[PDB]
Amino acid sequence: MTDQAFVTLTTNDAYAKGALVLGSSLKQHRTSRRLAVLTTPQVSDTMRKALEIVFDEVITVDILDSGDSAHLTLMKRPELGVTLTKLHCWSLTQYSKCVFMDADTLVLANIDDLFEREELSAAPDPGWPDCFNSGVFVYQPSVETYNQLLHVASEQGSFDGGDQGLLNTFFNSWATTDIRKHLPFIYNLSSISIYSYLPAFKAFGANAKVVHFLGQTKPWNYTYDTKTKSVRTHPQFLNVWWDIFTTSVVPLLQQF
Amino acid sequence: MTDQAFVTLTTNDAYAKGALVLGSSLKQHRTSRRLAVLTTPQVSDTMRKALEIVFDEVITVDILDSGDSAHLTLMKRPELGVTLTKLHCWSLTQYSKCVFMDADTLVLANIDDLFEREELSAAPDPGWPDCFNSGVFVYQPSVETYNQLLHVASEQGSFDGGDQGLLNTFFNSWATTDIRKHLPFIYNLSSISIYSYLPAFKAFGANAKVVHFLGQTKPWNYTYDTKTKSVRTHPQFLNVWWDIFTTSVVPLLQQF
Ligand SMILES: O=c1ccn([C@@H]2O[C@H](COP(=O)(O)OP(=O)(O)O)[C@@H](O)[C@H]2O)c(=O)[nH]1
Ligand SMILES: O=c1ccn([C@@H]2O[C@H](COP(=O)(O)OP(=O)(O)O)[C@@H](O)[C@H]2O)c(=O)[nH]1
Ligand SMILES: [Cl-]
Ligand SMILES: [Mn+2]
Ligand SMILES: [Mn+2]
Numbered sequence: 257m258t259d260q261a262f263v264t265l266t267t268n269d270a271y272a273k274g275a276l277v278l279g280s281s282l283k284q285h286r287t288s289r290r291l292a293v294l295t296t297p298q299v300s301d302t303m304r305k306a307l308e309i310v311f312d313e314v315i316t317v318d319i320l321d322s323g324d325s326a327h328l329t330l331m332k333r334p335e336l337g338v339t340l341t342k343l344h345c346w347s348l349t350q351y352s353k354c355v356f357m358d359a360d361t362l363v364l365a366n367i368d369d370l371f372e373r374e375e376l377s378a379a380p381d382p383g384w385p386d387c388f389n390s391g392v393f394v395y396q397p398s399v400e401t402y403n404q405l406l407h408v409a410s411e412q413g414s415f416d417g418g419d420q421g422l423l424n425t426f427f428n429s430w431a432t433t434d435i436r437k438h439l440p441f442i443y444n445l446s447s448i449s450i451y452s453y454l455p456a457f458k459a460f461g462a463n464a465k466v467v468h469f470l471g472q473t474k475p476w477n478y479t480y481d482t483k484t485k486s487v488r489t490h491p492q493f494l495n496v497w498w499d500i501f502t503t504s505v506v507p508l509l510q511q512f
Numbered sequence: 513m514t515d516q517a518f519v520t521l522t523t524n525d526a527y528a529k530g531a532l533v534l535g536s537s538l539k540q541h542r543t544s545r546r547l548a549v550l551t552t553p554q555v556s557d558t559m560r561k562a563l564e565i566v567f568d569e570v571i572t573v574d575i576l577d578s579g580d581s582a583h584l585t586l587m588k589r590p591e592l593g594v595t596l597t598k599l600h601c602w603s604l605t606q607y608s609k610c611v612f613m614d615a616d617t618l619v620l621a622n623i624d625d626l627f628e629r630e631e632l633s634a635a636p637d638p639g640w641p642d643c644f645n646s647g648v649f650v651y652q653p654s655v656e657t658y659n660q661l662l663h664v665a666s667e668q669g670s671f672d673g674g675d676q677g678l679l680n681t682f683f684n685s686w687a688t689t690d691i692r693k694h695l696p697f698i699y700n701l702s703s704i705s706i707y708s709y710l711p712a713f714k715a716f717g718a719n720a721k722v723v724h725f726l727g728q729t730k731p732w733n734y735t736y737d738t739k740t741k742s743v744r745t746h747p748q749f750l751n752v753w754w755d756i757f758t759t760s761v762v763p764l765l766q767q768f
Contacts, residue, residue, distance in 0.1 A: 453639030
């Protein structure tokens, strides 16, 4: 499918590492879809070159440029900078349907069946499960939707200072409407829950399709021993991320 | 409705305090339904007498008695003692439909609209939101369902050593089937989430219909200053619980 894509985002080199691991994981599990990444000019040439290899499309978004439609909203609401760059995922009208995935996600199994879903399909957020987590969602690119999202960001901002609040407010029927728009939690399995509700993880965690490295500490904030093949609680997913980073991404960075 | 009920559970005097506050809160918000409480012989005469006043029906369940259908399962799986007592909520076939509520819940608004729901309707659990939280659920009493639940408890036990695992395993279509069986989170608002995902709470918490005092520390494990009318983070709900306990329940205990 040349008209459907996974779309991720990186505004810097650190999240580009995640993007590269995510992209690699999607290729590893043989996606039949395109891979697109929103980037900013702050992503360095080296990360960019690697992103150009891993991804089928590298889109450059610069909301610091006043030529960008979101720039005036960034001025008004700096807290929404990442959110606003993220919203440009809706501008990818070369694609008919996309799965947005946070750059701190990791694919463990083919998830092309997400493309059966409609906008807006997303997994519940742990913590407040009547909100969906915006780290993984199925959406339909549309300039109108983009404009409407931008408009809401401008007018209301986001109840949580990020995209999740914004997306939940805009797609507010999610909690009460259409169970098919609730992506199984295994398609956006928060790394925290992989020890928060541990019995549930024991019971259902082996079904994980997507791990989402929530919280302050991202996989690249860890040190990884390449000999023992383990990072420096429950490091299983961290080690998968780092195995991909070590195996696929680091050498890729070295050929550029 | 004489055939529909809120059903709670207390196996001891401490949770009887919760039961009494819950029951009082349900009366406070003018439920048109019956109030039933499952109790064990371990609930003391004083708590019982108060329970007999607050609740329309006090049911005594004794799974330590070998005459109980669950007793043999308790022997096999002691971890399920509370769960097994709880399952007897399905034996309440005097009622056509019930809302089970944990004794550590607190009603903040009329929730009689829960009786529009079918078995099994429950709110998502924070932590693993493809499980429902079993602190509040709409169910239909049935000896068959009771027997089937008991059978599963006997054969598999519970993936989390409690009722939640058991109920989720038995009612396992919940996550993927019928959005109407997802009770809004506000009908079972985990006290933890009232600081875990705090922006969401700020945004939606004022809509709270039911507060669920999750975690080790229950409202009765707090000290409450009756003069300042506050307990000894975000004590709002604790103070509501204690206002009811102080105002309604304590004097009630004193008249028995
Ligand atoms: O400084 C940042 C912050 C986030 N992001 C992107 O926006 C998403 C926001 O999710 P993040 O993982 O940062 O937040 P969390 O999921 O931990 O709550 C990331 O995955 C990245 O794709 C980015 O590129 N640069
Ligand atoms: O020792 C106990 C433990 C629990 N329960 C009942 O079973 C429910 C189990 O939920 P609990 O609040 O204890 O667990 P949590 O919701 O905190 O995970 C309680 O609300 C009570 O109704 C009880 O009566 N005695
Ligand atoms: Cl539905
Ligand atoms: Mn993320
Ligand atoms: Mn409880």
